[PDB]
Design a protein around this ligand. Sequence first.
Ligand SMILES: CCCNC(=O)[C@H](CNC(=O)Cn1cc(C(N)=O)c(=O)[nH]c1=O)NC(=O)CCc1nc(-c2cccnc2)no1
Ligand SMILES: CCCNC(=O)[C@H](CNC(=O)Cn1cc(C(N)=O)c(=O)[nH]c1=O)NC(=O)CCc1nc(-c2cccnc2)no1
Ligand SMILES: CCCNC(=O)[C@H](CNC(=O)Cn1cc(C(N)=O)c(=O)[nH]c1=O)NC(=O)CCc1nc(-c2cccnc2)no1
Ligand SMILES: Nc1ncnc2c1ncn2[C@@H]1O[C@H](COP(=O)(O)OP(=O)(O)OC[C@H]2O[C@H](O)[C@H](O)[C@@H]2O)[C@@H](O)[C@H]1O
Ligand SMILES: Nc1ncnc2c1ncn2[C@@H]1O[C@H](COP(=O)(O)OP(=O)(O)OC[C@H]2O[C@H](O)[C@H](O)[C@@H]2O)[C@@H](O)[C@H]1O
Ligand SMILES: Nc1ncnc2c1ncn2[C@@H]1O[C@H](COP(=O)(O)OP(=O)(O)OC[C@H]2O[C@H](O)[C@H](O)[C@@H]2O)[C@@H](O)[C@H]1O
Ligand SMILES: Nc1ncnc2c1ncn2[C@@H]1O[C@H](COP(=O)(O)OP(=O)(O)OC[C@H]2O[C@H](O)[C@H](O)[C@@H]2O)[C@@H](O)[C@H]1O
Ligand SMILES: Nc1ncnc2c1ncn2[C@@H]1O[C@H](COP(=O)(O)OP(=O)(O)OC[C@H]2O[C@H](O)[C@H](O)[C@@H]2O)[C@@H](O)[C@H]1O
Ligand SMILES: Nc1ncnc2c1ncn2[C@@H]1O[C@H](COP(=O)(O)OP(=O)(O)OC[C@H]2O[C@H](O)[C@H](O)[C@@H]2O)[C@@H](O)[C@H]1O
Ligand SMILES: [Zn+2]
Ligand SMILES: [Zn+2]
Ligand SMILES: [Zn+2]
Ligand SMILES: [Zn+2]
Ligand SMILES: [Zn+2]
Ligand SMILES: [Zn+2]
Lengths: 282, 282, 277, 282, 277, 277
Amino acid sequence: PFTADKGKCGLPEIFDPPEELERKVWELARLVWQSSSVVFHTGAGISTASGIPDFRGPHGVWTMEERGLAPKFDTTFESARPTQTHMALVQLERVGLLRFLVSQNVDGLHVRSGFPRDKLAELHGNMFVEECAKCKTQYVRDTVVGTMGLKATGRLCTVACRGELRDTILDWEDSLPDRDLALADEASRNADLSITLGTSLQIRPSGNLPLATKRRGGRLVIVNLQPTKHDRHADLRIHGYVDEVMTRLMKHLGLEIPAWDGPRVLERALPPLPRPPTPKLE
Amino acid sequence: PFTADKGKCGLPEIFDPPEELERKVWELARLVWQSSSVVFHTGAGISTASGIPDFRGPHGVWTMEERGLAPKFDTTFESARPTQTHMALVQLERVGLLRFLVSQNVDGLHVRSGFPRDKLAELHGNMFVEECAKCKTQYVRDTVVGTMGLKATGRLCTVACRGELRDTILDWEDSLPDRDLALADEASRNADLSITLGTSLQIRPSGNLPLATKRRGGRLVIVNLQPTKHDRHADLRIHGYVDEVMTRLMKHLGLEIPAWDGPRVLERALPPLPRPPTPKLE
Amino acid sequence: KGKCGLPEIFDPPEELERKVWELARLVWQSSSVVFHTGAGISTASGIPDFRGPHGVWTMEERGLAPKFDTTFESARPTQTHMALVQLERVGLLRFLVSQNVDGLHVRSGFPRDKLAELHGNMFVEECAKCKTQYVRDTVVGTMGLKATGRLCTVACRGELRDTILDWEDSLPDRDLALADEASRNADLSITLGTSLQIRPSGNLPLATKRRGGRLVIVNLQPTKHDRHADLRIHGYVDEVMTRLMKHLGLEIPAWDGPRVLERALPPLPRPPTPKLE
Amino acid sequence: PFTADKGKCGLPEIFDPPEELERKVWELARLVWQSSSVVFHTGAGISTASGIPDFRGPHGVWTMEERGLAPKFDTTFESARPTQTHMALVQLERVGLLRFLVSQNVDGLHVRSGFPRDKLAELHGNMFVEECAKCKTQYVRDTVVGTMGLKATGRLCTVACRGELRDTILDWEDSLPDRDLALADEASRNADLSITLGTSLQIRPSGNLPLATKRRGGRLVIVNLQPTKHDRHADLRIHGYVDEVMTRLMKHLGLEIPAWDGPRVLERALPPLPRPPTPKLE
Amino acid sequence: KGKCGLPEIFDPPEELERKVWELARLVWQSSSVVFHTGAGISTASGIPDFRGPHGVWTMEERGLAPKFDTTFESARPTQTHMALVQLERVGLLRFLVSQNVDGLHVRSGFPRDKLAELHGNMFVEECAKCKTQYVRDTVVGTMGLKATGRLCTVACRGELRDTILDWEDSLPDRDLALADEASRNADLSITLGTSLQIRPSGNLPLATKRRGGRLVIVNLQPTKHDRHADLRIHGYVDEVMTRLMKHLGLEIPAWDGPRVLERALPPLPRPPTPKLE
Amino acid sequence: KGKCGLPEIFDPPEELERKVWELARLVWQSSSVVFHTGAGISTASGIPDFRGPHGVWTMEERGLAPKFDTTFESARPTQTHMALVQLERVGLLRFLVSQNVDGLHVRSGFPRDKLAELHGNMFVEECAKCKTQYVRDTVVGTMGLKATGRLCTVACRGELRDTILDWEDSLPDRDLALADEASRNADLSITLGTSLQIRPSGNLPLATKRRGGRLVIVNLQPTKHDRHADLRIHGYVDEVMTRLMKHLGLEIPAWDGPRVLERALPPLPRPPTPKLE
Ligand SMILES: CCCNC(=O)[C@H](CNC(=O)Cn1cc(C(N)=O)c(=O)[nH]c1=O)NC(=O)CCc1nc(-c2cccnc2)no1
Ligand SMILES: CCCNC(=O)[C@H](CNC(=O)Cn1cc(C(N)=O)c(=O)[nH]c1=O)NC(=O)CCc1nc(-c2cccnc2)no1
Ligand SMILES: CCCNC(=O)[C@H](CNC(=O)Cn1cc(C(N)=O)c(=O)[nH]c1=O)NC(=O)CCc1nc(-c2cccnc2)no1
Ligand SMILES: Nc1ncnc2c1ncn2[C@@H]1O[C@H](COP(=O)(O)OP(=O)(O)OC[C@H]2O[C@H](O)[C@H](O)[C@@H]2O)[C@@H](O)[C@H]1O
Ligand SMILES: Nc1ncnc2c1ncn2[C@@H]1O[C@H](COP(=O)(O)OP(=O)(O)OC[C@H]2O[C@H](O)[C@H](O)[C@@H]2O)[C@@H](O)[C@H]1O
Ligand SMILES: Nc1ncnc2c1ncn2[C@@H]1O[C@H](COP(=O)(O)OP(=O)(O)OC[C@H]2O[C@H](O)[C@H](O)[C@@H]2O)[C@@H](O)[C@H]1O
Ligand SMILES: Nc1ncnc2c1ncn2[C@@H]1O[C@H](COP(=O)(O)OP(=O)(O)OC[C@H]2O[C@H](O)[C@H](O)[C@@H]2O)[C@@H](O)[C@H]1O
Ligand SMILES: Nc1ncnc2c1ncn2[C@@H]1O[C@H](COP(=O)(O)OP(=O)(O)OC[C@H]2O[C@H](O)[C@H](O)[C@@H]2O)[C@@H](O)[C@H]1O
Ligand SMILES: Nc1ncnc2c1ncn2[C@@H]1O[C@H](COP(=O)(O)OP(=O)(O)OC[C@H]2O[C@H](O)[C@H](O)[C@@H]2O)[C@@H](O)[C@H]1O
Ligand SMILES: [Zn+2]
Ligand SMILES: [Zn+2]
Ligand SMILES: [Zn+2]
Ligand SMILES: [Zn+2]
Ligand SMILES: [Zn+2]
Ligand SMILES: [Zn+2]
């Protein structure tokens, strides 16, 4: 609680100059085209552009705490809109270029974007999600569930059970949801391409899953404004804003970024849509 | 034919005053959110708003016959458009809030609305539908099949059979289609919420299926302008026009009522669409 | 209240089909088409008429009451309402003259500047003082040009009154002027679900005739002026408008729920016209 | 190469007069409505309207060669747009009226139209498609693969293999892809309706597959401006432009011809959409 | 009939790409862009040209006949036709001057008030008396300004005639006036699939030059005025218009089938312009 | 630079809800609504403000720097930006007065003829000579009305300059004229995320008051003119605009990416108005 190790907070930002930036995004486009199974890992940096502060950035929650100051929110969790990044991911899954999405984020935005829950692992929980301790049925609310740390929310299970509903936000000492972890791990191991977005990769085991991909010769790309724990393991490191990178990527892949219909929950991935043919690369 | 018992015809209409109306529709919204499996039962009252007279209402077919007068049609069966109600049901199935639809209606409008035939039981038949007596293959026509009472229509089966095509409109003495009945029954038993719309519930076994739900503690709601046979069994009775109720319900559920593309037949339910997250209710 | 509950007439299918082709000809050939509607175009949305078998008056005579299958608020525009919307959008409808108080033309999105609502609108109140109109989301509580108990809010605090004519009232000068002018300059007037029994409304169609203008009547029952029409189509207006739009190569557009459009928008692209003669 | 038999080139075109044309398209509409399984066979004539010359027509590749002249292209293969015909076929598959599509065309347009690859047999190959000689994984490029005759393209396999990529365009002496052929054959045999579009039916076994359908009493329709090898076997021969025929057909079937989103590849058929009810025919 | 069947020229890819970027520059920089089209923009819809390898004239000389892959009625607008539609919609096209009789610009939905059809339109007849135009759904049966056998229907019974110029006929005064005025005031004229060999049509582009206006020619073959152009792009017009719209950040819109739009609608939102120099 | 970093105020939910209903009343009742925006409406797209807790000035005082979560080029319009787009489209917004230099109103598709950008726009340069404006796809490289190093291309070769006011500069005469006129004639001014601390911009809202016009302020922090407002809503502008559009029965439209619309298009159909009193 007080003792919690919060890692390296407030490290200097790095910005690749424009031409290096454009050439790296081109290479990401190349890796994606070539890959059989692509897995995305996201953290708090993909939501900063919607007004939600991250943890370890210059104005992050833990950074600010270290300086005796406060983080700033520019939205509520209910009023937050998914970023261009979140919506690019929706599309990448729909056209079959994204196999699995692993997120450390609690902010509920991938769910709310309409990303399919069976291709998503929410490793640290979701603030809109409460779970029955008896039957394990989950409920995805339109408002944040008012507790954190796996506590009773005060509501009961309505399954055709009356079990005590509890939040899914892990405290420091709590181990990860086993189903989420087992599926993120399997996906990570079997991927031939793992792409990290807006995560410093400092938390175990979450930040370690992209390394699993480096097994059997998989490639690792890291998109992030600050250094990350596994920088030396990356085949490609892109230092820029994740929305600028993802919009350029989509442009290269010949994909529109889909409109957000408002908060909407999709349990199961729909059938894959058509996508553009692949370039001749070599 | 002449002997047929036509039940209680022409009973006085009941109208819940506005504030009671709005509070009951709110509670229906609450029951739907809470339910695992929701089954809808429809009858003739859901089509009166498209110009098709019902049977037992004040200007109903059997009511008018009793007074020596005639029912009035404001449309042909071919020219009838599905109501706001019919289209709300299309949407509820698409987003996964409706498990099954049971209808006593012959008017062909749920089919024509594009409601999926494998989630629909047409207990008393469909006027556009003719069936091979040999192979049992059904054909869904753009025009009413000119006979009633399971008679030869005059056309033959084209299955890659030459069997005699017959109508599917039950006469009084004819027992129900076994497949339709078996599936309506299963759905009704296993539901935890059954909602009746525009049916007096006077015909066996059709009107009795919503009671099956009251087994193992399922809830029964009845929407209807007139009294119904099972009024005392209802957890909730809403006395108002079904379009006013369904539009308000959709508003609360955060669902648009979809546009009608014209007459269109869907054999199999598509994959479920995203829907809004559920409120915290208790 | 006039002749009520007269027998319905139904053209056989082959005739029905011939006559709609003939109406399509007239539309294609005409420069200025005016449409006149009454209560028959709302009966397929659950709103009774006045003088049909089960109409308001026809039922009152027999001691019966008319039946509603909807509230005014929860009524949806018919396929006919929406076809007229499209007809105006692609420049094939010049003006629309309605007897109907039921609010549906307005709520369909039809432009108010190309519509005369000769007998009022249940959803519309007007300021006794500044004459400003308000289109409400529910029926204005009164009938017969009475105080609704609301006051104007323009920049007035005038007394707002319903727009619903009692038997003795003069028609809106503005609406009637515009509807007369349109009727007079049309080379084609088409009536849809009106018995044509009220003055002056029922007679506006005849003004088209005075100029060599054609006149089409579309009605289940006999109307006052059947003798003056070049074509009478006995059938359900929805059936007739649906076939006609098909011939015109026009889709019937989706309703986006209640919506108020004050001014006609620029005209949309339309199908090329057939060779006729 | 030089020896290759190129069949009957440059035969006179036949045009059915308008009223005969309209009556035949009506009968095609009738056969389609009646059929359980409909299989389409296409060749080069369905792409002439996009600026790609056919082989045996009056200005065909082989015809012109015979007269010592050159064919004319009005587009590149990359810049070619699918015809009204190609897009009608997309729609017919989507609404479930087309079971399978067999094509002799190499021009890549059915793929690019977004026609589902698992309902398509490309008997003579696709110019955008290259294939690994090791693992047999196919790649669908945005540009024509620069070789013909099953040669090494120069690129290698990227499967999570490094096998030599080769083109899929058959030379004269090369036998057909076995998977494509086996599936076209199965479909053809089991169909009760086979419709040929823009093919002279002169190549074995491709042009012979529509005859398979005449087994067990299947019907054969041939749409083509010139005579075809199997003219005498046809139940119906329509002599006119394939776009005029298909647009009229769609009009009768009550189907819109869908918009082309640009080049887009769909591996697996989506779930079937609603379609209009069938007329009463007899 | 002039020089026919001249060799085709194909710019290599890298050049091709450079030149389209250069055309995008000119569009972005220009205030008033006029487009001039002839038969080369319809060849990818199966309609032969006149003077290309397999053109009407080129084939007639050699004893061959041209080949159609479509009827006029069943022809669809090209990607080029539809890009011009979009170009006018977002305010990047001022006027369109076409030599083409094939009906496609009109049927694409292009606004008739921003188009001069200098040689006629196969689908259009006109009243000898009142000069009223009719855009039909099929080709008017005649050529050379003849009676079609139909009569006017305005409010006239005038004799309707095709609009298709024979060799000896003066061009529509109205269309030619407007096309000259546009050509003169443009700072950019772009020609698409025209050999520029007919007077006066072929010369209208040169009028842009007289003012400091730029001139771009886009054509597989040499044209009359290659010497006066600032940029010549040798390639297929579809390829060139597709890349160009991509640079402009414009989608090519779907065709809703044959549709007739008389007047340009208000302009749509367009992408912001790049920094150039 | 004025009072910076003042404490935030948060209305409790029930109050919050009451006050938005009250703002919906005012919109429905008003004939002419002007909206005034500053840096608070862009903070939810990752662009810092000036005087909030972590604002440009508030941070500079404390030795801190403001933080960007986006580039100007990669910033997307907020739900607020897009709601204003819709509000203007259905005729419920008369004019928009912004202090914001960030380009978002323009890039949202908002019509330039109904917007005063009082302090400039990072994407806009202007010709010193002919005064022609250019809306670029990237930020113009300079600030303070300097040469950008590009020259005009109208039909001019004038020196193009940024439009970004330094502290000492007079506001665009044109934009300020129009914004004053609008403010004066509005019966409702609504401020969104502006502390109202700069002259003359901050004071334009008060001009509405002088006529019996209402004034609403929507801001997390105290503003200069809280004492003159009829309603103060302390909350996040996105939350407030979303609830309000829901009450108005308006959808918030999708962004089609950066797009420049010079002139307001004809008004769209809107929901009928509730009965109020
Ligand atoms: C991305 C950082 C921004 N902050 C957040 O996203 C919130 C905390 N937010 C607030 O306290 C502020 N707050 C503000 C609101 C408003 N904006 O007005 C509102 O409505 N609700 C609210 O809670 N999330 C969390 O506190 C949980 C983070 C979490 N960590 C772990 C974990 C597991 C294993 C090891 N180490 C940590 N599992 O869950
Ligand atoms: C909802 C009531 C309105 N009437 C209807 O829907 C029609 C009967 N309609 C007409 O006779 C008038 N008619 C009018 C047309 C036009 N409107 O011009 C037209 O085209 N065809 C036509 O038939 N349906 C029926 O007659 C069948 C009702 C039925 N009952 C049973 C059943 C089973 C077990 C026990 N008890 C009864 N199974 O089927
Ligand atoms: C439909 C006829 C038009 N021509 C085509 O489609 C091209 C050949 N085209 C060109 O040589 C010209 N060319 C032009 C381009 C441009 N238009 O600028 C371009 O980009 N590429 C290009 O190759 N296709 C073929 O050459 C292969 C035909 C094929 N036949 C067989 C086969 C199998 C069994 C028995 N008998 C034959 N398997 O594949
Ligand atoms: N717009 C942006 N573009 C690119 N990178 C960005 C952007 N915004 C921020 N970043 C980078 O995004 C990175 C975010 O890193 P951290 O703040 O550690 O977030 P986590 O998800 O990895 O924290 C993991 C867990 O630790 C906590 O205890 C919670 O339990 C979390 O669930 C920074 O390096 C920024 O530079
Ligand atoms: N707009 C409306 N809103 C609400 N309720 C309505 C509305 N319109 C009518 N109702 C009510 O809707 C109810 C309709 O009840 P019945 O007329 O018995 O129809 P069924 O489907 O139950 O008849 C069953 C079978 O019996 C026949 O023999 C046939 O075989 C039928 O298939 C009334 O109580 C109305 O008050
Ligand atoms: N679906 C239908 N299709 C065709 N005709 C129809 C349909 N439904 C009804 N009809 C015919 O539609 C006709 C409707 O005739 P009337 O009832 O006199 O309505 P009005 O608008 O002309 O009455 C005028 C005023 O009278 C009052 O005082 C009020 O002030 C009214 O404003 C009938 O003949 C039906 O046969
Ligand atoms: N618009 C049109 N409408 C109708 N028919 C048309 C049209 N255009 C052309 N046709 C007819 O379309 C027909 C096309 O016949 P062929 O040219 O033999 O093409 P294939 O696909 O059968 O050649 C098979 C293989 O042979 C080669 O060696 C390759 O390997 C091919 O893959 C003609 O009869 C035209 O009259
Ligand atoms: N896809 C293509 N891409 C580019 N250029 C093309 C394409 N297809 C053809 N071309 C070129 O397009 C050019 C077309 O040149 P011409 O055939 O003279 O057509 P006109 O419209 O200029 O003839 C004017 C009048 O002449 C008659 O008397 C009629 O009255 C006509 O109205 C060729 O040079 C091709 O190289
Ligand atoms: N999401 C939000 N919701 C509501 N209020 C917000 C939000 N975010 C910030 N605020 C409030 O938004 C307010 C923003 O106030 P200021 O920072 O002065 O911006 P200006 O546009 O008024 O500054 C004017 C000029 O000053 C400079 O010199 C430049 O020239 C500017 O153009 C704060 O009070 C926050 O409480
Ligand atoms: Zn439980
Ligand atoms: Zn059978
Ligand atoms: Zn007043
Ligand atoms: Zn391989
Ligand atoms: Zn004339
Ligand atoms: Zn200048």
